[PDB]
UniProtKB/Swiss-Prot annotation:
This is Proteinase K. The gene is PROK. Binds 2 calcium ions per subunit. Residues 7-279 form the Peptidase S8 domain. The active site is at D39, H69, S224. Ca(2+) 2 binds at T16, D260. It comes from the Eukaryota. Belongs to the peptidase S8 family. Hydrolyzes keratin at aromatic and hydrophobic residues. One of its GO terms (biological process) is proteolysis. Its EC number is 3.4.21.64. Ca(2+) 1 binds at P175, V177, D200. Disulfide bonds join C34-C123, C178-C249. The chain holds residues 106 to 384 of 384 of the full protein. It is an enzyme of class 3 (hydrolase).
Length: 279
């Protein structure tokens, strides 16, 4: 399949070279997989989600996304126009309040919630969790993300936006999950992206167009926006039978575009997620 005039990051993950604007993908499109977006919530009624999104859990007075961040991330996973995996099922877990903040104890509960809740849902091709959030190092937050991976969910997390080594942030620094840095449309490391040997992969992160609350759209930047490109790519490859939740991060790194990025520090991987679709 081909989507003309796609956002640049969708085009980039289906291309060997930068500067193109069509997104190529197998029409299966993640059907039969499930992606949990663990964030400020999701505006499920946005037309772009087509009834494929729903809120399953909140820790605040409401389950609605009053911020936008969680809706934008979910749109990059799975919206019809701006999403990688256009037929996947999206589940929202609201661990962050509408200012974008939340306690580590709440985020830990949300991760253990997903490891159980997947047994209540129909996801025969597999289950992914997208975590576009982070803070200072916490061994309890890292262990929670490791449990979720071990339970059989592909866990993708954002490296963080400090232009610093990600070893000092959680859950970015947890080695068993998939830690995602950000690149821009010119195949440079985004100037804010964290780096380090704990990174696994890069995805598009600067100037990313996706869904927003109030049924709108906008373009914003961060490792937050890179992470759901990889989450959606995982769900897409799992639906194709190429990989499993346990090995998807390794499979994405195996099959990535290699050596294409500039401004990569010595000792950080030079790998850019790629769906390897041969039309
Ligand atoms: Ca959410
Ligand atoms: Ca990692
Ligand atoms: Cl996310
Ligand atoms: Cl890793
Ligand atoms: Cl690369």
């Amino acid at each position: 399949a081909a989507q003309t005039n796609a956002p640049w990051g969708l085009a980039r993950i289906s291309s060997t070279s930068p500067g193109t604007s069509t997104y190529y993908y197998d029409e299966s499109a993640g059907q039969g997989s499930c992606v949990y977006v663990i964030d400020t919530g999701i505006e499920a009624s946005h037309p772009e989600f087509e009834g494929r999104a729903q809120m399953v859990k909140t820790y605040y007075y409401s389950s609605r996304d009053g911020n936008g961040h969680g809706t934008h991330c979910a749109g990059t996973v799975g919206s019809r126009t701006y999403g990688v995996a256009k037929k996947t099922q999206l589940f929202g877990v609201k661990v962050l309040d509408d200012n974008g903040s939340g306690q580590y104890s709440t985020i830990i509960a949300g991760m253990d919630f997903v490891a159980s809740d997947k047994n209540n849902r129909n996801c025969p091709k597999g289950v992914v969790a997208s975590l576009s959030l982070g803070g200072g190092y916490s061994s309890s937050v890292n262990s929670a993300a490791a449990r979720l991976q071990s339970s059989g969910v592909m866990v993708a997390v954002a490296a963080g936006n400090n232009n610093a080594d990600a070893r000092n942030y959680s859950p970015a620094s947890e080695p068993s999950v998939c830690t995602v840095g950000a690149s821009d449309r010119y195949d440079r490391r985004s100037s804010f992206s964290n780096y380090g040997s704990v990174l696994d992969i890069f995805g598009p992160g600067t100037d990313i167009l996706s869904t927003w609350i109030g049924g709108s759209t906008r373009s914003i930047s961060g490792t937050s926006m890179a992470t759901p490109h990889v989450a959606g790519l995982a769900a897409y490859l799992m639906t194709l039978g190429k990989t499993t939740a346990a090995s998807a991060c390794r499979y994405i790194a195996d099959t990535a575009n290699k050596g294409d990025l500039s401004n990569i520090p010595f000792g950080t991987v030079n790998l850019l997620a790629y769906n390897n679709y041969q039309a």
